[PDB]
């Protein structure tokens, strides 16, 4: 009669062993979840963490790739530097040797002059022989005139 | 009779008057000598004056042949002081390139640890999937279980 | 009493399929739960593969570039051997050159000193020469005087008997 | 007195004698001396012929020395040429090693900027995942208090009759 109960206790037994398999099983999802987000996060930070490095090189090849313009800017100015004297060199030296060409032909001027002067000392001898020949030739005259002249009479 | 010194007085007036004309001749060749050594002495001193001219542009070819050697001189050290430099400025550029080959490859040793991460966290998310699907087909089972184990009497 | 248990029998039979529209009630609904927890796993599966592909989507850009980057080195290592050569092959001419130059200087010293010798011996001709002037007047005053004698010498002498 | 006149003819032909005797003398004796100093000159001459001849002749040797020095300032001027030719040339090559390094460092900053903008997307793009984490977590925290709910919702509904 009464024991119509003991249907309702095993039917109540029913859902409090249903509710644990049940309640364990969505904690038991819920707990997975939060675990699944506690693994990636985990993989996620280190990965992230790459970043700094990554930045160092950048900045790195940055500060390298400026050193090298400071070069090439340290190059031209020495280029254009050593140029420039060459360049002075180069006229100091053609100023000296259109000088030399001057000097060079002043001494080809002064070589014909000597020649000139050379030539008429020889003019100026050969004159004074050809003077010294006809002298001779003068005086054997005046000399004969005298001795013609030392006759006396007749005829 | 005495006038036989009228021979005598003609006779010697043959010498006064031949003296003299052979004195004279005497005295215009030593006169003629004189006046050539007059002649030349002049013509060679003005010959011996170009001496110093012709010394002037030697002594001039002479500087200006020091000169050129001097601007020699300053162009070797030129040279060799702005190649200095010039290699100088090659050694640091290398050496930057040499810094940038090797940033260079830490970069791409980073690409591909970048990869190893990226590909694992993708097998991460497969296996935290493939484990929602297993956890899903357990929940079925116990929950069956349960309707299962909803019966009463007989058999 | 007969009846008195065909009471007992209905509420029975009432409780128990009242016990049973519950039991399938919350059956269903509970698999409706386990059912939306697994779609709600593989939707964010699905979500964080899209993103994951699109981030390692870079590997490929991050790869030109340093490819890029890597033969822009060579072109730099090019231009530095380029630049080697030049300088080199400038270097050598120019040691020619200053070679060519320094014989050359030689040579001019050569023809100078040989011109400042020439000079001087050309002056000690021409001091012979003015030399030989004052030797010959010398000769000649003394022969014109030496001569008046022998012409003076001989008039004195000539005029009548002398020893 | 015959006699007395041959004594004066044989004196006056002795003296005429004695007087021939010396004018034959001296002018013998005059044209050896004409004749000396045409000697003394001819030979003077002849001497200092010999000296100008020998003087005259260091012209040739004189135009040797600035011939040859001539042609060495030409060997200058030819190496100038060159010298200038080399630097000339060497300014040139350098010009373009110039901009061609130029062109190239430009073309690495612009890499090197690429890799800096792909650096920071690449970050915001894994934050965007750490986000979706916290999201999905979120919503996976509320979806089993949501069901927690409706699972004792009807746990303490299903005993009796509720309304």
Same mark, same amino acid.
């Given at each position: ?13 029913? !859902? ?27 993989? !996620? ?20 790739? +400026?050193?090298?313009?400071?070069? +090439?800017?340290?190059?031209?100015? $020495? ?24 000097? $060079? ?35 054997? +005259? ?14």
């Amino acid at each position: 009669l009464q024991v119509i109960e003991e249907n309702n206790q095993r039917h109540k037994a029913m !859902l409090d062993s249903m509710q644990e398999k049940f309640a364990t099983i969505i904690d038991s999802s819920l707990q997975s979840v939060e675990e699944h987000a506690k693994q990636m996060h985990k993989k !996620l930070e280190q990965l992230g963490a790459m970043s700094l490095p990554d930045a160092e090189e950048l900045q790195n090849l940055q500060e390298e790739l +400026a050193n090298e313009r400071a070069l +090439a800017q340290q190059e031209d100015a $020495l280029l254009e530097s050593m140029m420039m004297q060459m360049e002075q060199i180069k006229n100091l030296r053609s100023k000296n040797s259109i000088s030399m060409s001057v000097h $060079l032909n002043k001494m080809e001027e002064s070589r014909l002059t000597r020649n000139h002067r050379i030539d008429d000392i020889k003019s100026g001898i050969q004159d004074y022989q050809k003077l010294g020949i006809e002298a001779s030739q003068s005086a054997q +005259a005046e000399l004969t005139s005298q001795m013609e002249a030392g006759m006396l009479c007749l005829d």
